[PDB]
Every structure is written in structure tokens, then in C-alpha cells.
Amino acid sequence: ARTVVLITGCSSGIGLHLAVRLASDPSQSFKVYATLRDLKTQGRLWEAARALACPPGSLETLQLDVRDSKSVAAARERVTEGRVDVLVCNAGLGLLGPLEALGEDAVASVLDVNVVGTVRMLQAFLPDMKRRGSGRVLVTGSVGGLMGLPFNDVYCASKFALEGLCESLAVLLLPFGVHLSLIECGPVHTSPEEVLDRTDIHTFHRFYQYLAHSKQVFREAAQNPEEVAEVFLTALRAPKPTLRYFTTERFLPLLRMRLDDPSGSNYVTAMHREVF
């Protein structure tokens, strides 16, 4: 029997590349359900699928909006095999800007998709895994879930939230045979006027500095999505998967600094100098 995989957020980036990587595996081991918020965005997925020659029936798309528990339930009912071996919670939103310039709705949305949406998926698929005593859950994490990044306050809040959520569940799930892992990604290749109206000129200037810095880090360190997708596959095949996989060791030093001074002083000074 094939390994049934259901992946959220497949219209672009990591989820699109993971879905076609699995569906096109030479062994034909996987049956992938690539889910998307809006089916109008599925063209790139199908263009990639043909480029990798995914066999007919290896990949199927479903509409799944993680903000709606009814959409989660209807997608679950569409898994014809009646089981999900691997669940990949990857749907996510970013949010960048001065905290006081962010709309209340944008903040609530980032938390509803990134955090509550993952809870909705776990509530919908975890119980059957627990009963069977088998199943793999992979969650797309971020270096921003491990350390705070300026002008990413709500995005980091959401990614930190996934760390707490997953770590808490892992403690309980240890003896159930259900394995949860976070795949910790760094940067991956995948109007000023309005910001200025909602913040001070000094914060505005620091935002520019952050953006200039971020562009350089991205140009220098962004990983190809194929390399990142492969870390998900590595986690899936591990007999005894760990709670966290890192796609790069680039940020481990900063993470260790952070983790070694619980007052936070060293990290805050170090990251302020790094960005600014």
C-alpha cells in the first residue's frame, strides 16, 4: 500500500516542491493530497508535476482553508484511502512591518492560519493516528520560531507558538507511536507611504535598514526548495524521528548564544548589531 500524504499550503514554495518531490518519487511509494486555500492557484503545482513526470494518480489537489474547520473536515473526507500516513502542516502567512503599522485583522489572520489552522489540522487528523498507533506529522518551522526577529513580531509570535504547540504534544505522543517533527527552515528560494503614515520616522528608517539587511542575507543564504524538501523526506523515513530537524546549521551559533543566556541580553545585543 502507498504512504498517503496530505500537505497543506501547496500553491507555492516548500509545500509545492515537497508535494511534487513525493509524488514523483522513483519508487512510487507515495500518494499525495496537495491542498490549497484557493484552487485558482493550482497551476504552478500542475506545471511542476508535469515537469517531474508525476504518474497519473500520484498527486491530487483538494481545496482546504485552514481557517475553516468545515473545510478541514471536507478535505479529510476526500482522502479515499480513509487514512493519512503523513500529515504535513505547512500552510503559513508572513507579516512584516512596524508592530503599530500592522492591521488588527492582519495580526489575527496570521495567528489563525499559522497557529489555530495547525490546531484544526491536528484535531482533525491526530485521533485516528493515536488509535492506530502510527502516523507521522511534519510541521514547517522557521528560524523565526527559535529567535525573535525585528519587524517580524507577529510572524515570530506565530512560529514560536508552533514550537510550544508541537513540543507540548510531543511529550504526550512519545509512547503512542505517532511521531511529530518540526522542520526548521532558514530563508528559502520560493507601500512605503502607508508604513510611513502609521509609524515614526526613526522606526521607518530602521525598517529600511532591516529590509536592506534581509535582502543581503537572502541573496547569500537562501536555500533551494529542493534541498529543503529533502529534509522533510529525511524526517519521514527516520525510524525514530527527533522533534526537530534543521535545514541548515547557519543559525545554530546565534541559537546557542540565545539559549546560553536566559536573561536574553546577549541575544538582543547580538541580533541588534547583526541587523542594524
Ligand X SMILES: NC(=O)c1ccc[n+]([C@@H]2O[C@H](COP(=O)([O-])OP(=O)(O)OC[C@H]3O[C@@H](n4cnc5c(N)ncnc54)[C@H](OP(=O)(O)O)[C@@H]3O)[C@@H](O)[C@H]2O)c1
Ligand Y SMILES: C[C@]12CCC(=O)C[C@@H]1CC[C@@H]1[C@@H]2CC[C@]2(C)C(=O)CC[C@@H]12
CA atoms within 13 A on the CB side of 180: 25
Distance between CA atoms of residues 69 and 105, nearest Å: 19
Q: Which helix (H) or strand (E) holds 264?
A: none
Rounded CA-CA distance 52/269 in Å is 46
Minimum distance from residue 142 beta carbon to ligand Y (Å): 7
Decide if 245 is catalytic.
no
d(CA 253, CA 257): 6
Residues in 129-168 that interact with a copy of itself by CB under 8 A: 130-131, 144-145, 147-154, 156-168
Q: Is 275 in the site for ligand Y (CB under 6 A)?
A: yes
Nearest Cα residue to 173 out of 213, 122, 211, 214 = 122
**Residue 228, C-beta contacts closer than 8 angstroms, at least 6 positions apart:** 14, 17, 183, 185, 188, 247
Place of cell 541548515: 248
Q: How far apart are the first and last CA of the chain?
A: 53
Residue type at position 200: D
- 189 labelled ligand-binding: no
Residue 25 contact among ligand Y, a copy of itself, ligand X, none, beta carbon within 5 to 8 Å by kind:
none
Among candidate residues 123, 195, 203, 118, the one with its CA nearest the CA of residue 163: 118
State the binding string over 186-205 for a copy of itself (x if CB under 8 A, else -). Answer: -------------xx-xx--
Instruction: Report what 213 binds from ligand X, ligand Y, a copy of itself, none; CB cut-off 5-8 Å by kind.
Output: ligand Y
Residue 61 pairs with which residues in a beta bridge? 34
**Which region among 32-40, 86-94, 97-105, 221-229 touches a copy of itself (by CB under 8 A)?**
97-105
Contact in structure between 87 and 121 (CB atoms under 8 Å): yes
Residue 100 binds: one of a copy of itself, ligand Y, ligand X, none (C-beta under 5 to 8 A by kind)? a copy of itself
Residue 78 binds ligand Y (CB under 6 A): no
> Which residues, 30 to 89, sit near ligand X by CB under 6 A?
37-38, 41, 64-67
65: three-class secondary structure by DSSP = coil
Among 15, 98, 144, 145, binds ligand X (CB under 6 A): 15
152 binds ligand X (CB under 6 A): no
Per CB under 6 A, does 167 bind ligand Y?
no
59 annotated as ligand-binding: no
Answer yes or no whether residue 239 interacts with a copy of itself by CB under 8 A.
no
- Any contact of residue 276 with ligand Y (CB under 6 A)? no
Site for ligand Y in 182-221 (CB under 6 A): 186-187, 213-214, 217-218
Distance from C-alpha of 73 to C-alpha of 76, rounded to nearest angstrom: 5
Residue positions in the annotated binding site for substrate? 142
* Positions marked active-site: 155
Residues that bind ligand X (CB under 6 A): 8-15, 37-38, 41, 64-67, 91-93, 113, 190
